[PDB]
Every structure is written in structure tokens, then in C-alpha cells.
Amino acid sequence: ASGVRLAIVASSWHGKICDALLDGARKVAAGCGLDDPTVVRVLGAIEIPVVAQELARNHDAVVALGVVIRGQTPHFDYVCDAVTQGLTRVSLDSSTPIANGVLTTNTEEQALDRAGLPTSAEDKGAQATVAALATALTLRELRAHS
Amino acid sequence: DASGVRLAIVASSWHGKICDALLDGARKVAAGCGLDDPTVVRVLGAIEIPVVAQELARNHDAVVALGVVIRGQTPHFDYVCDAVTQGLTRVSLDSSTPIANGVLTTNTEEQALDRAGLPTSAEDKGAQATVAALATALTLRELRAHS
Amino acid sequence: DASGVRLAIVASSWHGKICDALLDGARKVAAGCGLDDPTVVRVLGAIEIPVVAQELARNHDAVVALGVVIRGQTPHFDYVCDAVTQGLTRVSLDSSTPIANGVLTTNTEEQALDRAGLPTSAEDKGAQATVAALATALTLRELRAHS
Amino acid sequence: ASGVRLAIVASSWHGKICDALLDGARKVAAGCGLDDPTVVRVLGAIEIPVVAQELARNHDAVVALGVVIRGQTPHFDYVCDAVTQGLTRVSLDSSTPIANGVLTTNTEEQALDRAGLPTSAEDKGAQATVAALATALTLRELRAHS
Amino acid sequence: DASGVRLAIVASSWHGKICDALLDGARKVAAGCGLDDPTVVRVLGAIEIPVVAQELARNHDAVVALGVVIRGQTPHFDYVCDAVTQGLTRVSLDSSTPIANGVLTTNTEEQALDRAGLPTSAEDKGAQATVAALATALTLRELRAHS
Ligand SMILES: O=c1[nH]c(Cl)c(CCCCOP(=O)(O)O)c(=O)[nH]1
Numbered sequence: 001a002s003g004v005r006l007a008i009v010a011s012s013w014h015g016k017i018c019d020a021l022l023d024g025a026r027k028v029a030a031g032c033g034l035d036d037p038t039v040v041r042v043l044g045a046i047e048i049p050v051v052a053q054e055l056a057r058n059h060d061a062v063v064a065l066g067v068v069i070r071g072q073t074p075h076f077d078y079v080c081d082a083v084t085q086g087l088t089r090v091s092l093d094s095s096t097p098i099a100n101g102v103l104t105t106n107t108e109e110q111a112l113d114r115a116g117l118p119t120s121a122e123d124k125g126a127q128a129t130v131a132a133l134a135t136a137l138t139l140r141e142l143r144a145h146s
Numbered sequence: 147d148a149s150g151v152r153l154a155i156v157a158s159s160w161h162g163k164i165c166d167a168l169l170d171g172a173r174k175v176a177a178g179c180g181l182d183d184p185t186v187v188r189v190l191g192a193i194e195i196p197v198v199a200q201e202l203a204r205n206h207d208a209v210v211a212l213g214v215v216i217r218g219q220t221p222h223f224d225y226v227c228d229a230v231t232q233g234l235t236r237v238s239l240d241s242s243t244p245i246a247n248g249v250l251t252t253n254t255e256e257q258a259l260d261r262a263g264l265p266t267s268a269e270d271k272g273a274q275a276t277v278a279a280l281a282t283a284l285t286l287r288e289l290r291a292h293s
Numbered sequence: 294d295a296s297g298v299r300l301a302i303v304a305s306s307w308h309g310k311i312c313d314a315l316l317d318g319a320r321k322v323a324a325g326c327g328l329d330d331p332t333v334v335r336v337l338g339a340i341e342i343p344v345v346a347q348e349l350a351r352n353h354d355a356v357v358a359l360g361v362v363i364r365g366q367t368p369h370f371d372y373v374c375d376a377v378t379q380g381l382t383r384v385s386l387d388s389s390t391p392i393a394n395g396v397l398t399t400n401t402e403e404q405a406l407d408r409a410g411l412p413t414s415a416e417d418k419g420a421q422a423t424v425a426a427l428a429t430a431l432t433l434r435e436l437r438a439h440s
Numbered sequence: 441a442s443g444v445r446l447a448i449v450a451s452s453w454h455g456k457i458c459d460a461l462l463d464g465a466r467k468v469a470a471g472c473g474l475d476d477p478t479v480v481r482v483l484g485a486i487e488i489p490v491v492a493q494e495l496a497r498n499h500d501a502v503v504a505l506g507v508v509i510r511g512q513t514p515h516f517d518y519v520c521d522a523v524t525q526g527l528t529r530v531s532l533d534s535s536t537p538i539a540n541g542v543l544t545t546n547t548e549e550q551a552l553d554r555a556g557l558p559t560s561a562e563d564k565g566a567q568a569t570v571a572a573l574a575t576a577l578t579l580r581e582l583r584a585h586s
Numbered sequence: 587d588a589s590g591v592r593l594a595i596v597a598s599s600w601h602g603k604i605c606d607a608l609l610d611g612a613r614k615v616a617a618g619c620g621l622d623d624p625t626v627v628r629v630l631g632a633i634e635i636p637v638v639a640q641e642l643a644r645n646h647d648a649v650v651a652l653g654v655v656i657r658g659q660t661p662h663f664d665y666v667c668d669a670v671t672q673g674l675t676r677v678s679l680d681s682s683t684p685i686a687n688g689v690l691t692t693n694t695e696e697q698a699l700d701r702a703g704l705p706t707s708a709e710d711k712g713a714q715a716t717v718a719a720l721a722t723a724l725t726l727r728e729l730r731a732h733s
Pocket residue numbers: 011013043044045046066067068069070071072073074075076079261
């Protein structure tokens with residue numbers, strides 16, 4: 001994957017968990033021969049699609065990282081609807097994979113469990129970067145050459 | 147920071163005290179960041195915000211959307227929140243412009259009060275949404291064309 | 294006052310009595326604001342509104358959507374309300390024209406009656422939507438080009 | 441209303457219920473004096489929008505007929521979501537009424553009761569055709585003419 | 587006789603054994619209808635299907651979408667299914683190409699196995715989706731311009 005132009009946009013709402021996701025994505029990127037992907041920080045998940053849209057203009061793949069955790073109101077449902085709709089539209093408008101590393105949990109421990117910390121069951125940042133890179137390589141192979 | 151950003155704020159009026167409080171928070175953040183004169187526009191309800199947001203996005207770096215939807219006796223709340231979600235999301239991507247989320251969507255009036263940055267509120271979504279708008283605008287300025 | 298704005302109203306007919314009442318509300322607000330002859334068009338059910346509202350938006354500053362969707366025995370209500378929600382939101386932004394929300398989405402007949410501005414009704418969604426349509430039309434006029 | 445150009449697309453999943461919807465639609469078009477409508481069969485509700493899109497290029501109105509009955513899984517919800525987004529989009533892209541004749545029920549009993557059979561409470565194939573026809577005529581009047 | 591139709595199949599790999607069974611059902615229908623060599627592409631998860639389906643749609647009469655989403659401990663399952671639903675629906679209509687539904691969306695693994703055309707499965711979702719794809723391609727063929 002050393003030739004792929006990779007972008008990562010990570011939100012900052014719930015800082016420790018977001019850093020963990022990013023750390024996972026970067027390590028997968030580096031392990032695949034990419035030492036310097038484009039990394040951009042935004043505040044919350046609502047801000048990801050617009051930044052992903054900009055990044056997709058000149059990258060083969062964008063990894064979307066963030067953490068939405070349910071509060072006391074229906075607001076959680078609408079934040080996740082907005083991000084779902086936006087990323088989906090961005091990937092199709094740009095014909096570019098936007099990988100899903102945006103945790104959507106009922107609880108904080110569930111998010112921690114999926115963030116790739118030493119005792120976590122899995123790592124979404126890593127998983128989303130693999131998805132982005134595999135899908136970019138597939139698309140490159142399907143498209144025009146040579 | 148933030149003094150060159152062209153900010154717009156669109157605020158509904160459906161629950162007066164709450165709406166005015168969100169708008170105050172948005173405006174105080176803008177002033178704190180060197181923005182004394184953002185474009186401020188008022189609409190009746192949340193459903194009116196997207197079309198007005200769309201107009202504003204043509205000549206601003208960021209738009210803050212403020213409103214309050216509180217659940218009543220019917221499914222109506224669900225559809226109002228869906229319309230706004232789809233609309234703001236479409237607007238931000240059609241215009242490549244941050245549309246910051248300061249629209250409260252609550253089960254109770256208590257909860258909305260608690261999130262509007264009134265004296266005894268736990269938090270202020272109006273202030274938070276303005277931080278998001280300004281920061282994303284600045285990020286986009288950095289990402290886009292300059293030499 | 295809105296004596297210069299071009300208003301259209303599209304009202305469905307499924308549940309006639311409540312629909313006529315919504316229309317009455319809409320027309321009264323219109324007349325009170327200086328508009329005695331808005332464009333009024335009738336459609337069968339709520340699913341017909343967006344396509345007609347689309348046509349009306351090409352020739353008006355605001356469209357008021359009126360209708361009544363009352364829950365039955367099946368999930369069907371959800372998908373009818375979903376469709377109207379997506380459509381009207383699309384139409385408003387495609388045409389950059391306010392499409393005002395006067396479409397009741399209720400669990401019972403009692404609830405729709407209570408929101409249709411009949412004599413003993415708690416409120417009048419037709420009136421409310423119409424105020425939203427005109428105030429938004431006027432706001433947009435002030436925002437857009439004039440010399 | 442004898443001058444409107446009418447197309448009907450019906451899915452075949454739950455065949456007995458689908459035919460009764462179609463018969464209801466056919467009776468209303470015949471009673472309103474139409475030149476026999478363009479009638480197309482598709483397998484399930486999921487296929488309706490893409491065929492509706494084709495028919496909409498050559499017709500004043502499309503009647504969409506189908507039956508979705510909830511099963512053991514959440515699949516029902518997503519099937520109904522797809523058809524909702526699709527037809528809505530098709531009607532607005534083409535500026536053409538796409539009438540609602542898609543039953544979305546919990547049980548087979550409920551579908552039967554809405555399919556215009558002798559002991560049925562309602563006739564949705566009929567209801568949808570009236571809506572299509574009336575909306576076609578309304579748009580014809582709103583649009584440009586002498 | 588579908589020997590003339592250009593068929594693509596995109597299948598995810600999340601839950602490998604089940605995806606493979608779905609693919610096998612698809613292939614068998616395809617081969618039974620005269621198509622020994624359809625375009626087959628593997629993607630990681632269901633989120634990746636729309637963008638690849640879009641690419642396939644430029645060069646094919648029909649695309650079959652195969653995949654498996656099984657609900658976990660969080661609301662994540664709902665959003666993943668919302669994304670796939672919206673994406674595929676958008677792709678079929680942008681490109682006017684049948685995109686057949688072979689994406690399982692189940693609460694349990696047991697449910698998904700039962701729908702995947704295994705020896706003891708109640709039904710075969712892969713086979714079903716392919717019949718839908720091919721049949722819809724043929725219909726569109728007769729509906730469109732020919733002599
Ligand atoms: O990126 C993000 N993440 C999260 Cl967790 C939230 C808040 C989730 C909503 C919880 O708040 P409550 O519903 O007001 O208690 C957000 O807005 N944006």
C-alpha cells in the first residue's frame with residue numbers, strides 16, 4: 001500500500017478514546033509503508049463529513065475516527081444519523097472510500113473496549129485503516145491501466 | 147485566534163428564553179475570538195433553519211445553527227428532528243461549509259434549559275457549536291489553496 | 294406585513310374535516326398579513342404533497358404543506374411520514390424556497406383535531422406553518438440581492 | 441381522466457396479495473376510461489424504484505405496487521427504508537407522481553385486509569391509482585397550456 | 587436465458603463462512619442462467635460495498651450486493667445498516683442499474699446461517715438476490731430502446 005494517498009480525520013470529543021483510535025490507524029498506516037498520512041483534528045463527529053469532503057479531493061482514502069456516546073436525550077440518535085448520511089454521501093460524491101472508525105456506543109466502557117487500549121477487545125482505528133487501504137487497492141485495480 | 151473568519155448565526159424562536167440563551171452563548175464566543183459582528187438571523191422554528199442556513203453559507207466561512215426541539219405528545223418530534231438533520235447535513239456538503247450543531251433535541255424542557263447556558267445550566271450548546279464552527283473554518287482555511 | 298410575498302398552499306384531503314380546518318388557519322394568517330388570494334391546491338394524501346409542492350415552488354416565495362397522517366394498525370405510518378419528510382426537505386433546498394410544516398403526524402384522531410385550530414383546539418398548525426412560511430420568505434428577501 | 445398515460449409496476453413477492461393489488465389498480469384505470477396502462481412485474485419491493493425510474497420517463501404517473509411483511513429479523517425495516525428513499529427520489533427527479541401502493545405490514549392478515557379482496561376492509565391498489573390519476577391531472581392544470 | 591447480461595457481484599468478508607455461502611448461491615444461479623464468469627469483487631465489510639458497487643455499475647447491467655451484518659452490543663448495527671441502505675439505493679438510481687439486495691441484517695448468527703443457502707438453511711439469500719438482479723436487468727432491457 002506504499003503508493004496510496006491516505007487521509008485521517010479524527011474528532012476530539014472524548015480525548016483519550018480518540019487519541020487511541022488515531023494511534024491505531026497511524027500504526028497500521030506505518031506498518032503498510034505509509035509513514036506520513038494527512039492527519040486532521042476536528043472537535044466533534046458532526047464536523048467530520050465536511051473535512052472528509054475536502055480531504056477526499058486529493059487522497060485515495062479517508063479514515064473517519066470519532067466517538068459518539070449516548071447521553072440523556074435523543075441527541076445521540078441525530079448526531080449518528082448526520083454522520084452516517086454525510087460520510088455515505090461524501091464517499092459516493094468523490095468515489096473514494098471513507099472508512100468507518102466512528103464509535104457509536106451506549107457507554108464509555110464500550111468505547112474504551114473498541115479503541116485498542118492495552119486491555120480492549122478490539123481496535124477500530126486499526127480496523128478502519130485496513131478497510132480504507134484494502135478498498136483503495138481494490139478500486140485502483142478495477143480502474144484504468146495500462 | 148479566529149478574527150478573519152466570516153461567521154453567520156441562524157437561530158430559531160420556538161422556545162424564546164432557551165433560544166435567546168443559545169444565541170447569547172454563540173455571540174459571546176464569537177466576541178471572545180475577535181468577532182464582534184457576525185451575521186445574525188432569526189427564524190420561527192427548526193424546520194426553517196436549513197433554507198436560511200443555505201442562503202448564509204453562500205458568503206460565510208461557517209454557520210452556527212441554533213434551535214430547540216422538545217418532544218410533545220405525538221411522533222412529530224421525530225420528523226422535525228429528521229428534517230433538520232437531513233437539511234443541515236445536505237447544506238454543509240452542497241456548500242462545503244461547516245454548519246455547526248447547536249440545535250437542542252430533548253425529551254423535556256428541563257433538559258433543554260440545562261443545555262442552553264442559562265445561569266444554572268450544566269452546559270452551553272450555543273457556545274460549543276460556535277467553537278466547532280470557528281475551529282473547522284480555520285482548519286479548512288489551512289487545508290485549502292494558499293501559497 | 295407580507296403583502297408582496299407569493300404564497301402557495303397545498304393541502305391533502307385524507308381526513309377532510311381536519312384538512313379543511315388547517316387550510317382555514319393558513320388562509321386567515323395569509324389574509325391578516327395582506328394576502329387575500331394565495332395559490333391553493335388540493336391533493337389526495339400526504340404522499341402527493343412533495344411532487345405538487347415542487348411544482349408550486351417554481352413560481353412562489355413560500356409553500357405551505359398541509360395534511361394529516363394518523364397512525365393505524367401497521368408500521369405504514371412511519372414510512373408515509375418518512376417519505377413526506379425526505380421530500381419536503383429536498384424540495385425546499387432544491388428550490389431554495391421555504392416549505393412550511395403544517396403536516397400533522399399523530400397517534401389518534403383526538404390529537405390531530407386538537408392541533409387543527411377548531412374552536413376547542415389547543416393549537417392551529419395551519420396558522421403556525423403559514424406564519425413560518427411568510428416570515429422566512431421575508432427574511433430571505435432581505436438576505437438576497439437588492440440595491 | 442382518460443387522457444393520462446399510466447404505468448403500474450408491481451412486485452411478485454407474496455404473489456396472491458400482489459395480484460389483488462394489481463387487479464384493484466386495473467379496475468380503477470378501466471373505470472376511469474384509460475388506454476390500458478403499461479404494466480411491469482418485478483420480484484420484490486427493492487427492485488421497484490429502478491423500474492419506476494424507467495417508466496417515469498414515458499408516463500404521467502406511476503403506480504407502485506408491492507407487499508412487505510415483517511419477518512424474524514430487522515430486514516423488514518431496511519427493505520421499507522430503501523423503497524421509501526427510492527420512490528421519493530424517483531418522483532422528485534422525474535417530477536412525476538409515484539403513487540403509494542406498497543403495503544408494509546406486520547402480518548399477512550393485515551396485508552390481505554388491505555388488498556381489495558371481497559372481505560377486505562380496504563383496497564390499496566385502488567387508493568394508489570386514484571392518487572396517481574388525480575395528481576397527474578392536477579399537475580397538468582398547474583403546468584403550461586392554453 | 588441471461589447469457590447476454592453483464593453481471594457483477596460484490597461481497598464483503600465480515601463473517602467469512604456466511605459471505606462465502608452467499609457468494610456460492612449467487613454463482614450457481616448465474617451459471618444456471620448461462621453466466622459462467624461474472625465479475626466478482628471482495629470487500630472487507632458492508633460499509634465498503636456502495637463505493638465498489640458504484641464502480642462496478644459503470645461497466646455492468648446488474649450488481650449483486652452480498653454481505654452480513656449481525657447486531658452486536660452497541661447501536662452500531664443500526665448505523666451500518668442505514669449506511670448500506672442509503673448507499674446502495676443512491677447507486678442503483680444514479681446509475682439506473684439494478685443493485686440487488688443480498689445483504690443479511692440479522693440479530694443472531696443462527697439467523698444469518700439459516701438465510702445463507704447452506705445445506706440446512708431455510709432459504710438462500712445469495713440465490714435470491716441474483717435472480718432479482720438478472721430478472722430486473724432483462725426487464726429494463728425490454729423497456730429501453732431497441733429495434
Ligand atoms: O462527537 C460527538 N460525540 C458526542 Cl459523545 C456528542 C454528544 C452525544 C450526545 C450526548 O448528550 P446528551 O444527550 O445532551 O446527554 C456530540 O455531540 N458529538
